[PDB]
Amino acid sequence: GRTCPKPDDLPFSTVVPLKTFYEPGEEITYSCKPGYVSRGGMRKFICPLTGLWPINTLKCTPRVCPFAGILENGAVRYTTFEYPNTISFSCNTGFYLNGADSAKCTEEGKWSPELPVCAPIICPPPSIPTFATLRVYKPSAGNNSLYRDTAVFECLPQHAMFGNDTITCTTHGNWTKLPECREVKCPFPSRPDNGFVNYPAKPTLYYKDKATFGCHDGYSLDGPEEIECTKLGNWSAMPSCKASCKVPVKKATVVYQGERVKIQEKFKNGMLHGDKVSFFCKNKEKKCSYTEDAQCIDGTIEVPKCFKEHSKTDASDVKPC
Ligand SMILES: *[C@@H]1O[C@H](CO[C@@H]2O[C@@H](C)[C@@H](O)[C@@H](O)[C@@H]2O)[C@@H](O[C@@H]2O[C@H](CO)[C@@H](O[C@H]3O[C@H](CO)[C@@H](O)[C@H](O)[C@@H]3O)[C@H](O)[C@H]2NC(C)=O)[C@H](O)[C@H]1NC(C)=O
Ligand SMILES: *[C@@H]1O[C@H](CO[C@@H]2O[C@@H](C)[C@@H](O)[C@@H](O)[C@@H]2O)[C@@H](O[C@@H]2O[C@H](CO)[C@@H](O)[C@H](O)[C@H]2NC(C)=O)[C@H](O)[C@H]1NC(C)=O
Ligand SMILES: *[C@@H]1O[C@H](CO)[C@@H](O)[C@H](O)[C@H]1NC(C)=O
């Protein structure tokens, strides 16, 4: 008495009907699992009187999808293009993914969804701002522009721009923030005492209009010779003419800008309103020299208290403390 045993379990297959034993004459069918294929197709077998199932040539392997390793202007992540497998897509910079970023090989051996393509990122022609003009801009894609392209607006006269003057085509197909462009007037600048001021002869003064200053002979400027009307409606600065100082002493050696100078030579025509110098004083306890600062401020400069006129030895010739 001979039955056939439970059939062998082959990779990626099913048997039907699966029983634990078979009478001679019964039939089984081997089929590859979905997504798998094997040469020769199904195998049918009849359980023979010997009870021994015959050799099984069946060799199930995963269906293979069409080759998809080359995404023009992009990159595919894959191991193999077999049935269960999934593949990923991305694009090189300047390109976008037109389609799904992932795809699977199906039981039918197709890619699902359909493989994407990489397309160049494009911006439409940029909008020009009110009271603005386009200085430089040329389209590199017909009437449209490509990624990282730029345009810049110069704002037309008497108008001040707010925000960067250049716009860029971003990775999304749009431009960066546009500049705003308003008109700005400034008041007339105040004439300084002991000085003069020069500005254009016209009823109203606008942005980047320049007024220039000057001082009379005993005075110099508190600030810049030239100013201009700014974005905010005030001026760069508003300088005064301050008074120079007469040299305090007749003969002295002082420190002016890190160098030691003779004050009657360096300032033979007076000290200007900025000018600061350092006088030399004697520490009698330690028998050495030190300095103390003094600055011309609107016609006044005060010599330090410790200064005994360079008229022992001069303070400036004594060793430092
Ligand atoms: C230029 O494109 C950019 C791309 O984002 C776009 O956002 C939508 C408005 C829509 O048009 C969509 O199709 C685009 O993807 C815009 O720049 C910014 O992009 C951010 C990143 O995607 C986006 O985000 C968040 O930003 C803040 C977080 O601080 C949140 O408040 C916001 O609700 C989002 O969650 C951001 O929204 C977006 N900027 C704005 C103002 O929405 C940009 O708007 C667009 N236009 C211009 C003129 O630059
Ligand atoms: C020119 O003016 C700006 C703007 O300040 C304002 O100007 C007027 C419109 C008016 O509203 C004032 O009360 C404002 O102060 C000056 O910028 C200011 O600078 C300091 C720095 O902290 C401070 O007062 C404010 O933070 C700044 N203004 C704003 C609006 O934030 C600027 O200093 C002026 N320039 C000169 C050369 O005076
Ligand atoms: C791009 O140029 C003009 C816009 O200046 C437009 O009318 C034209 O149709 C565009 N080119 C083509 C080939 O359509």
Ligand SMILES: *[C@@H]1O[C@H](CO)[C@@H](O)[C@H](O)[C@H]1NC(C)=O
């Ligand atoms: C904006 O303009 C400044 C100077 O005009 C420039 O240095 C800067 O790079 C610009 N912004 C960007 C994002 O490039």
